[PDB]
Amino acid sequence: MVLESTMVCVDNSEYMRNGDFLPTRLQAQQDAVNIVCHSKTRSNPENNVGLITLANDCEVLTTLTPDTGRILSKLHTVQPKGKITFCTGIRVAHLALKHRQGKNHKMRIIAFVGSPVEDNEKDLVKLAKRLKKEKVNVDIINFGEEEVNTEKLTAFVNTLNGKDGTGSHLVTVPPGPSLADALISSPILAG
């Protein structure tokens, strides 16, 4: 029953509004949230999961809670329209998990990126050294499209955990209309 507090970050960005994935991108990532919340529930019932977005504002829709009923409520009518927001997405998730109570639990976050981001490389490398000085591991599960063969996230995860980091990954998006279980079939094994 490993100790973390898994912070799911939903993807209600405007490029997620199409149907290049299976019915709708929203529904596939919603079932992805279902399988990761039950997977981390069976991984530990002690740890708890709140959600956050990358919309117009990174809103704390759910506080970090162990029950998934509010998760099931808030995955509906998500308004999937708005500019992506990443760089202060790290900051809002980090301070949201400094609003925890048991700080021996790992600040584990998952990020859902399905839109072209406009980050600066220096901003994300300040975030890289920041999260090195903040004891955080984030596995980023990419969705949709970006600048194709997604860029700055290879850079961010590479600058994140150099010299024996082994805790942060980058699940890039497969650009094929595949089943969502095939997208999570490697992240359900490990990072």
Added chain:
Amino acid sequence: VPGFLQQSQNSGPGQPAVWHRLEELYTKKLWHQLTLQVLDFVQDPCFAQGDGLIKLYENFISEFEHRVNPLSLVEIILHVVRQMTDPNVALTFLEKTREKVKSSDEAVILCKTAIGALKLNIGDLQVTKETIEDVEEMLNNLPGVTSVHSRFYDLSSKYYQTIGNHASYYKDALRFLGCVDIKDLPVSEQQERAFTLGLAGLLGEGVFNFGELLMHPVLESLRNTDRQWLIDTLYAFNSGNVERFQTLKTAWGQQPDLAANEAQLLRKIQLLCLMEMTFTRPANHRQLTFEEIAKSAKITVNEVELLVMKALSVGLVKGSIDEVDKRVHMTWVQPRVLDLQQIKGMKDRLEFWCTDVKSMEMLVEHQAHDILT
């Protein structure tokens, strides 16, 4: 449908690079690069022979489009009804678009501005007074779209061209000019825009200068490039002097709608000279007699009473009248924009009051301090 786009896809040389991109847009089921690329193919400056053909494919897009914001529907429908220009077949298509959209963004406002944009054809009185009214009541809780207020203000200015209205253009032009900073057009619209703003809003009722717009700093290049008789006569209205020369030079320049408004504007400056002759004098021994009114306003004896009671009726003076000397008593002055000497007089007289209050309070405190103890 793919053949329906192949047959109109063959369009010429070179341009088939993005036409052969278009034959891969719908295949990948992207609906935002497709949105921007419909915006590209319709924003495309041509005669646009293919939009009246591809609008059936736009219905085919609207079939399993099913989420995309109809701001792109506006950005296509402007060129679409610019190609159609038919008041019969486009109003029905307009009402179809009005009923087939239910998205979370306000689309009823863009439908009402489509009603207004096809009201550019005819019917500038029919249902205008009624259906303009609902739009700003739908413009609630987020005016920061600013496309909604632009497209609403355009039909609001069309409502100003419902001749018997004058202050509406001024009032909502201040709103539009507040929500636009650069007019993001080839500049030549701005000059006649601020020019007719000057004209029409100067022909307003309660407005006389309101020199916040005379110091409106994005029409300053316009005030340098407009024919500067208008800016100068606005400086005369701000200066409020009756001043027959430049207020006849505007009658030299602006011939239409100045003879019909001539006695009105001269009556307005005849009441405007009061709220400057009381502002020039330092507000202490300021009870004005008939003479300086009849000298500034250059009107006769038995009209200055009408002149002052008009301003008393409006409320841009709060005084009273004796008539044994025809002394009109002054208990009022207009709040006026702080200039450099006004800055200095502000700080100096404010300090003058402050140090006097302090110096007397210190004497009160020290005189009765040791009985407080």
Added chain:
Amino acid sequence: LHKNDIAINELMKRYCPNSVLVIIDVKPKDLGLPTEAYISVEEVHDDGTPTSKTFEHVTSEIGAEEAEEVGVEHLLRDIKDTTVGTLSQRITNQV
């Protein structure tokens, strides 16, 4: 109040219809009256600002309750120069 002090009210307007705020000072260097209170209204301007959503102050004081009288008026025991009459107001007359 700083710039971010509108978003709190704009969150919890969905709890109280007029969610009023209170500005205090924990450091009593204020020789004025503490417990300032604002309220957010709109004043949409002649310049054509779309919506100016500004907090505006409504006046405030410290009220009374019978039990909290017992509490406060016992917790002081410190200063009483008033002998309420011609001189309970003169300290505040300097004020």
